[model samples]
Target: AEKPKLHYFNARGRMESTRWLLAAAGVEFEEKFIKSAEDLDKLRNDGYLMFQQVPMVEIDGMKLVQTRAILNYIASKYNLYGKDIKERALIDMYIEGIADLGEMILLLPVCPPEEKDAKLALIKEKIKNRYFPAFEKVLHHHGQDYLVGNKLSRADIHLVELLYYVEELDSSLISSFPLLKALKTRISNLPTVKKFLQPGSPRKPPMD
Candidate 1:
């Protein structure tokens, strides 16, 4: 069977979430990185990308674009979206917050050198004050390993990605949230996820 191909830059950028899901789904995929600005034009000229953007994941006889759509597709196909509208609503809600944090961290690549520290601090601030605490309570009181239902969902996958991204910034960020720390390690231990975390995997570095 031909593998799915991801079209994006070498850096993580917007493609990391799709990378996380595909790997977690135990799906083998190929990546076609855009090596030059002209390559993006060439990719766009192919007329397959709906929005003419990178992160066009060609899979299952369709070329998928848009991070949210791609993630949902893999999650649903892999049964990570859960079985009901309520579960998906919860997953969507929690993922929305994680997406906010992801965007904040993703902005660092273009951050001015001088403002990087401040931006990092602001991200950690929001994490501590807003994001982590909320999820911490979810895990603390609900007594579940997942954010929704009884199994791993796309939201948890996205959370672990954010968790590590934050750890790259400051490991101490999770010191107070034992639940989040446990969740990160728990998810990271999955067979599919462990492979992705390995040094040779398609997972990208922090930035260009």
Candidate 2:
């Protein structure tokens, strides 16, 4: 089989889940970083326009786009989805919930300048009241470190990346969510994830 090649900005962004999944699966793939319009134009010329975005993956002679789709595809191949249909359904729900939270974070850069503070305040409130509490409930209900299946699922990876965005938004965001903090630390210390978290890795560290 041909080796997989992942194309995205050098930053972690939405592609980190796929990267982490590939690493945990012991898959070998090349990272193609897009650092400029010229590079992105090259991607456009190469027919990546389904989404016209980075985080495109080429593997087994096919190109895949969309951050969630790419992550799901990789997870399916790696058996990270879950062990059965019921687990898979729960995993999907958790992933969708994480993505919903990520959408709020995505608005930070593009929100109106005058309303940025208010927008951020609203987001922080949601994190404290709605978002973080929901995820913490999932952790408590499952009584496991992982979000689903008592094992690492794509949602865990997505949550880890989402928490990085939260930290960037406000370092104190996770302080009230001990379960969230514990899960982050647990995943960060995994053999595969720990290696990926090391200095000089292919990707940059999460926001300080």
- TM-score, one value per model: 0.94, 0.87
RMSD of 2: 2.3
162-189, model 1: which lDDT tens digit per residue? Answer: 9998888787989999989899999999
Question: Any idea what lDDT model 1 has?
Answer: 0.88
Could you tell me which 10 consecutive residues in candidate 1 have the lowest summed lDDT? 104-113
Clashing pairs in 2: none
Give candidate 1's root-mean-square deviation (CA, Å).
1.5
The alpha-carbon lDDT assigned to residue 35 of candidate 2 equals 81
Specify the poorest-scoring 10-residue window by lDDT in model 2.
Answer: 199-208
